[PDB]
Amino acid sequence: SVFARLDPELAAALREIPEEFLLDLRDISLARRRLQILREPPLPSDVAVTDELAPNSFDGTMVRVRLYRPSEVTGPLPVLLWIHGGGYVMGAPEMNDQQCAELAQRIPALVASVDYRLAPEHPYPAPLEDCYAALRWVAERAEQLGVDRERLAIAGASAGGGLAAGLALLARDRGEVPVRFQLLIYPMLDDRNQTPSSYEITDPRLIWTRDWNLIGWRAYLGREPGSPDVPPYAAPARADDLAGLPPAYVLVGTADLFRDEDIAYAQRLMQAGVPTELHVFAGAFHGFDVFAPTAWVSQRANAEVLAVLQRALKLA
Amino acid sequence: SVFARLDPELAAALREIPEEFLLDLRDISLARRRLQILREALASLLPPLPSDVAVTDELAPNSFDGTMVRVRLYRPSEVTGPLPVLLWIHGGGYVMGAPEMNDQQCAELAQRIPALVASVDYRLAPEHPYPAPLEDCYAALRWVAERAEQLGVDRERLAIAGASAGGGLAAGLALLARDRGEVPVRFQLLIYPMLDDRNQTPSSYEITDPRLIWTRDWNLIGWRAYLGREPGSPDVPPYAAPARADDLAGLPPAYVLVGTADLFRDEDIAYAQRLMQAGVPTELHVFAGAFHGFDVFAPTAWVSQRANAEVLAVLQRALKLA
């Protein structure tokens, strides 16, 4: 009944999750250590996984970038900068090792996954400047990394899709690093929590609720959600001028808190002349693609993300 | 340049069409000829209709005015048990087209879903304005449901579908069928539907060159013919222009497809999002750099193949036995 608006296969996947495994953002610290304990087929043997460090001139820190290199392939590689989710307050690149290694192999591409700092300890702009530092490092060291600087895509899921959208705006405005494509998977990109869908999801059995969203945005901004003059890099839904952004793909489910902000952002990209594909999946919840990967709709989503990245990052 | 916003493979397809083959809606008889010529150019490049699909014509009674509506049936031979049914409604801006224009698409859907496909020969504007064309589709829907046990079809697996003007008629038919409460509809498949007469969305101003198939001016002429009133007039019924419908709750689950370079981009996105907000399960797919009719004008393009494969996959899933 909490599951009533879901694709029946997705409802069945969500029913098999024990109540004690669901997110509780009362205590960020517990939710994290509980999540990392939770997580723990092995990774492809033709993908080399290494950790590198990128200088961040924001505060002079070093950002860890986890690289996934397809060992088989020859010639220079396109690159996918991947940004993980977790509501700006949790997650690590390791949570997406499986997906990143699969994309490295199948695109094929060098996948560079950003170990960005978390809120509330490191609010905006720190986590986005971490992503920008990673992007700048890939671009600058392209020949050393054996990548084509002109085939640089950025991608993220949820909070990571918000960071990816804000990275596209920030990269465009700074005029240093060209970005070929942006792949936004159910991006968390509107702090205001005023869309119809932002009121529709309140039960923690649906993964990401309005209550979790308010806590995540409050931590990330260090300001109340919907505060005046939140920078467009922090909450891309607020960005007025979207002209000259990279070609985009946006995916979201109809049973996602972010349905309405994701549709509005994709439509505004289109109205600013940015080439944009938008796919809204019927009865799909937040994280359906990774929490229920055997569902017919999840397989369609995962096959499509691969197909659009193959096409976008393909040599001319 | 006119083709600047298009996927390069789609721009290549449109560059190949001679200027003299394009639609001119300022003369409806000329437009019907231009479409016959385009229809021949497209069909030229396609294989023959499958041999295992029987194509026949039947008549459905229309109690609106007592006329009979031709319904063109596409029956896959290799399936002897109960079939789902797809009611197909062709495009043509409410002023042109015939079911024969989609013989290839309907025969392939009948074979591949598989389903009985029933294609509506609705009357055209301006000779037969709203509501006649929609009541023709309603008469066809009612006939399929009533005759189901002799057609050998499952009336609990009845989908309605259309392209462009046919997608407007399909959306209007879902509303009319919901409100009359006689015939349950499992699914509505709307391909770049023409469903807002008001022409006030940003995308409705973006396409003015006839080389991009459907322009603002063609849209205003089509709507004017269909309504028998100026487009954007007050009180246009929601059945005639579904974008105007206030309450979308209880409509059949939906699939909506449109390209970013379609006049209908913004009305299609808005209709799909309003379905989702009314609790109707809805899939929306907007294809980057795709023009109006990209799926039939440029079927070999990568984006066209993805669109055609997805329409099939979605219908197979919506119409399969539980």
From TrEMBL, chain A:
Keywords, ordered alphabetically: Hydrolase
Alphabetically, the GO molecular function entries are:
hydrolase activity
Q: Does the keyword Transmembrane helix apply?
A: no
Query: Domain Alpha/beta hydrolase fold-3 spans what residues?
Result: 80-288
Segment forming the signal sequence: none
Coiled-coil segments:
none
Q: Which InterPro entries match?
A: AB_hydrolase_3, AB_hydrolase_fold, GDXG_lipolytic_enzyme
Residue sites binding succinate per the record: G86, G87, S158, A159, H286
Which Pfam family is one of those matched by this entry?
Answer: Abhydrolase_3
* Top-rank taxon, per record: Bacteria
PANTHER family annotated for this entry? AB HYDROLASE SUPERFAMILY PROTEIN C4A8.06C (PTHR48081), ALPHA_BETA HYDROLASE FOLD-3 DOMAIN-CONTAINING PROTEIN-RELATED (PTHR48081:SF8)
Name the record gives this protein: Lipase
